[PDB]
Amino acid sequence: WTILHYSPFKAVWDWLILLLVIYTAVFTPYSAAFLLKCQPLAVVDLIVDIMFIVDILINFRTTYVNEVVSHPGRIAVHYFKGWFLIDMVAAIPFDLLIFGSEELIGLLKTARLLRLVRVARKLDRYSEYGAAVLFLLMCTFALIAHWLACIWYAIGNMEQPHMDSRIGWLHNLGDQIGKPYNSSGLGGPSIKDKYVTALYFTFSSLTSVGFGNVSPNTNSEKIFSICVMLIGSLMYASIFGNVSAIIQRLYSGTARYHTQMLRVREFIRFHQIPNPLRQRLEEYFQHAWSYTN
Amino acid sequence: WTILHYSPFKAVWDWLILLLVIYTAVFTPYSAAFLLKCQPLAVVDLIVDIMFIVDILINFRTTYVNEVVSHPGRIAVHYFKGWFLIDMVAAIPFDLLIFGSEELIGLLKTARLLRLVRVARKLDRYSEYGAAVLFLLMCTFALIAHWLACIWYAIGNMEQPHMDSRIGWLHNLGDQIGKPYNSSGLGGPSIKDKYVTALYFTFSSLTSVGFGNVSPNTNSEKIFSICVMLIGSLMYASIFGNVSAIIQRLYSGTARYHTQMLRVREFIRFHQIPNPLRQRLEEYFQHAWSYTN
Amino acid sequence: WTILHYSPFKAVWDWLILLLVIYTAVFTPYSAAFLLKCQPLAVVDLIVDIMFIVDILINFRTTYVNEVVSHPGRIAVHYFKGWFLIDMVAAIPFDLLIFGSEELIGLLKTARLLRLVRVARKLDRYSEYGAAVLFLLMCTFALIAHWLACIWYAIGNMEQPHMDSRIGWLHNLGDQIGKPYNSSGLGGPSIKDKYVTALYFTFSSLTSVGFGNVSPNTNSEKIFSICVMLIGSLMYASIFGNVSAIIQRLYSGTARYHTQMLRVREFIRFHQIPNPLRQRLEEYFQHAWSYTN
Amino acid sequence: WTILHYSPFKAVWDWLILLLVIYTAVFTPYSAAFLLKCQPLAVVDLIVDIMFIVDILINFRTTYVNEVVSHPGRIAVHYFKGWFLIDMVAAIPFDLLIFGSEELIGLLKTARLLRLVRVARKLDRYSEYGAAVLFLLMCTFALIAHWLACIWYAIGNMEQPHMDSRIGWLHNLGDQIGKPYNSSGLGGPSIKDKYVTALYFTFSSLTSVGFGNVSPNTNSEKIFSICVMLIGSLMYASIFGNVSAIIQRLYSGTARYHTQMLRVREFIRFHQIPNPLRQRLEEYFQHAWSYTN
């Protein structure tokens, strides 16, 4: 058998794998930052890993254009020359292969972030619709804010148990919500308080509003904020440049319509057109425009 | 009888109903957030509800285009197939029908916010003039800031009387203005202090300036700010994209004029035109431009 | 005698009166806000008032276009029908006519701000050059920041001596710089400290950065900040829209040059042009472009 | 001998001198602000000064266009009439010529900042590639942030040892990180803490996010922030206007492609083209576009 790459099955499968790549982009950075020391999430994480291996089999059994190539040997060799390496490294189950704690293993499972490359390949499918690229651009913004929230928590959590003298952002969070840290590192804020504060601070940093309660005090926190001010300004020159451009592209029929209507209105004023003729001019423009766009 | 939809009466009535929809958009969210436990506002609220019912009768008696249809049966059936459902639900007097406190009834009167749909329909009338769409866009910005101020006060007021341990924004407001809360929830800021601080914080959040005195500390306050940072950035890519585009559209005659004037100026420099001819060139451009735009 | 409106004298006089209007726009709001209870400023203020009266005489003796009109009666009648009223009210010496303190008289001298209308008239002269409209736009931004700094100090100074209980921005300034207010309103910050802090806060508010040390606490201070967030966002959609557009207009020769150069570069790549011909193509474009712009 | 200005040697040498100008732009302001009272930096600083003198010799031995001029006398005279003065003053070793402390001498070595003019000349080379002008624009932004960080530290360090009464930004930094100043000016933050805080504050000021921990309190600090709010807004109207324009220029093939594809898609919808013809239309557009761009 062989799947045609343009078929309605392969279209639905590629949009299903977009949602599983978004699951990887959320829960892999989160587990590596917040959770390092069956459940519904533990079985879902296995189901998703199985579907990312099934997608390797579909890539051995899909046609390609280089009109179409359909021979299984020329398909398999094209994948082995192309993306099979990255798609395989994104699937190696290192948790079953290494023993050196669950911290090393859970950090090594960040190799799953190579699944973002499956979305970077298939942009010919995903970018075709204006409403789909608006969904992509807002998910890219919300995922950059989330990955930075995981890095910001790693910077806090790698300094809170140190000889910090109560300066870093996690001690200040403990004081600000009335959940202070004891000297042994016991007590303190919950994982919900620490995650919600980290995500709040990185949306605050990226959108460039500082409400004054979370702020960087250690040199590592300040160097992280210098980097997020560089990222946030390149990202606003790119993402929110493109988001407004796609909104203005969706609005483009109406933007042209107002422009041509005002040219007709000024022509009507300049020639001082009488009402029995004027109605025929402006009703003709409405008929012609609604007919042809 | 039957109203022509293009008549000067129906034009004035549609602009009158825009101002009554703005009254609904201000005073319905405000009453549901700040006031839940005759006066000039109580009689005005009844007068406005009566005029929104009269508008249902005008919709049973207005022509429509599908050239015009004027038969009262084809008018009435078109409205029953179309918007009559939403226009009726926006007019059901639930305060006269339900008994379960004045809190439930006052919250249920938020069904009046369906009147915003009357403005979403009639955009063919309201968007025709550049100065009118500037008035709409600044009212949309000021109303989003006000609706968010009502949600932010609901988030504060649903946590201030809880076992909060004096963390949320209303306790901090009480301390900052020297009107502290007693343990029983007595004393505290006035409704003017709480409304002005809520509206100040949501214009602060939407325009992305944090002056440092109001800030989100509870997880619900931080999740609200994460949402207002997403809303504010999509809204600036849309509203303030469009506001500058309409200002640049109003300026477009002058923007073209400077561009053509500088082309003529560079042509005059490049050919080194003598003054007796140069004056005739640049005065001709001024005459021709002021004649034709 | 009669001045030709296009003469090199009238050109120099109109640019001199722009600088005297900027003096009025700075020192009239400043004196009315900060100074209300000879010196170099007192004699300069008289010299400037004399030159704004001389400009009324020049307006009785200047030609106008309605080709030119040069008859002194048709000049004088055109000015009496036009701007003479506003130009006269901008020159009435109320300090010599009224007695009711120096506070009323100094506030009434704000009638001099009508001199801003002389700049609003003569925009045909002042907007002709791209570098001059950049100077205007940055002076409009710096003057809006200064007028708002005078309003913000009036809001502070009308509440500091009240039964405020040490909440408003001037008490907090006194504490922050170690110059606290005594209970009698004695001590406190200097006029330099109060002006520099007011101007700092309004550039902070207009550019939407809040560094956290100055913040609005009273309802009047918060309502002022709600207004400056509305002004600042309309102003950025207008002034900094136009400033970037004028910078991009000054850059337009280079922006076209890169665009045409890259079209020629892609044509050269697509046809795979040999070097002996390629040099002639790209050197011709450099010669033709530097010849014609 | 004589170097051809277009040769692959002179191309590599001009890109090497760009990296040595960036070294000067970083380490000269840093040494003059932070370090004023062999090592790897002391020998690198001598090596760089030698290479900037070798570049004067290359300028005496390079052809120029005024087709090319290659005569060594006409080359040398063109350089003596042109840039030789500034290139020589950028190389005078004042440290070997003056004795009046190492503070005066180290401040006088800021004459090396004239090397930025070598980059301002050669923009015909450096601006040719879109990825190179993105590297320039982000280095200009990061260097403006660094030069302002050196000025901000000079403003702090010229007031910290004064009769300040613990108001200025360096005393507040000492308190915020638990490294307070003793009355003699001993103790306090390290040069890493002071530099990282100064650079953090100027990226914070330029990108218009104030996180609330560093803020200007003295009049000199507030006047510096008024200036950085003026610089940052002109710079965002220029640098981040241009950075988005170059990103949109790099994207321009794809932006045209989506626009033409949607015109073809709307033509196909409007004429209701049957599938056997539709495939030939849209595959032809893909073939023609991938052939010609």
Swiss-Prot record, chains A, B, C, D:
<comment type="function">
    <text>Pore-forming (alpha) subunit of voltage-gated inwardly rectifying potassium channel. Channel properties are modulated by cAMP and subunit assembly. Characterized by unusual gating kinetics by producing relatively small outward currents during membrane depolarization and large inward currents during subsequent repolarization which reflect a rapid inactivation during depolarization and quick recovery from inactivation but slow deactivation (closing) during repolarization.</text>
</comment>
<feature type="transmembrane region" description="Helical; Name=Segment S2">
    <location>
        <begin position="40"/>
        <end position="60"/>
    </location>
</feature>
<feature type="intramembrane region" description="Pore-forming; Name=Segment H5">
    <location>
        <begin position="196"/>
        <end position="216"/>
    </location>
</feature>
<feature type="transmembrane region" description="Helical; Name=Segment S3">
    <location>
        <begin position="82"/>
        <end position="100"/>
    </location>
</feature>
<comment type="similarity">
    <text>Belongs to the potassium channel family. H (Eag) (TC 1.A.1.20) subfamily. Kv11.1/KCNH2 sub-subfamily.</text>
</comment>
<feature type="topological domain" description="Cytoplasmic">
    <location>
        <begin position="126"/>
        <end position="131"/>
    </location>
</feature>
<feature type="topological domain" description="Extracellular">
    <location>
        <begin position="217"/>
        <end position="222"/>
    </location>
</feature>
<feature type="transmembrane region" description="Helical; Name=Segment S6">
    <location>
        <begin position="223"/>
        <end position="243"/>
    </location>
</feature>
<feature type="transmembrane region" description="Helical; Name=Segment S5">
    <location>
        <begin position="132"/>
        <end position="152"/>
    </location>
</feature>
<comment type="subunit">
    <text>The potassium channel is probably composed of a homo- or heterotetrameric complex of pore-forming alpha subunits that can associate with modulating beta subunits. Interacts with DNAJB12 and DNAJB14; chaperones DNAJB12 and DNAJB14 promote tetramerization. Heteromultimer with KCNH6/ERG2 and KCNH7/ERG3. Interacts with ALG10B. Forms a stable complex with KCNE1 or KCNE2, and that this heteromultimerization regulates inward rectifier potassium channel activity. Interacts with CANX. The core-glycosylated, but not the fully glycosylated form interacts with RNF207.</text>
</comment>
<feature type="transmembrane region" description="Helical; Voltage-sensor; Name=Segment S4">
    <location>
        <begin position="105"/>
        <end position="125"/>
    </location>
</feature>
<protein>
    <recommendedName>
        <fullName>Voltage-gated inwardly rectifying potassium channel KCNH2</fullName>
    </recommendedName>
</protein>
<feature type="short sequence motif" description="Selectivity filter">
    <location>
        <begin position="208"/>
        <end position="213"/>
    </location>
</feature>
<feature type="topological domain" description="Extracellular">
    <location>
        <begin position="153"/>
        <end position="195"/>
    </location>
</feature>
<feature type="topological domain" description="Cytoplasmic">
    <location>
        <begin position="61"/>
        <end position="81"/>
    </location>
</feature>
<feature type="transmembrane region" description="Helical; Name=Segment S1">
    <location>
        <begin position="7"/>
        <end position="27"/>
    </location>
</feature>
<feature type="topological domain" description="Extracellular">
    <location>
        <begin position="101"/>
        <end position="104"/>
    </location>
</feature>
<feature type="glycosylation site" description="N-linked (GlcNAc...) asparagine">
    <location>
        <position position="182"/>
    </location>
</feature>
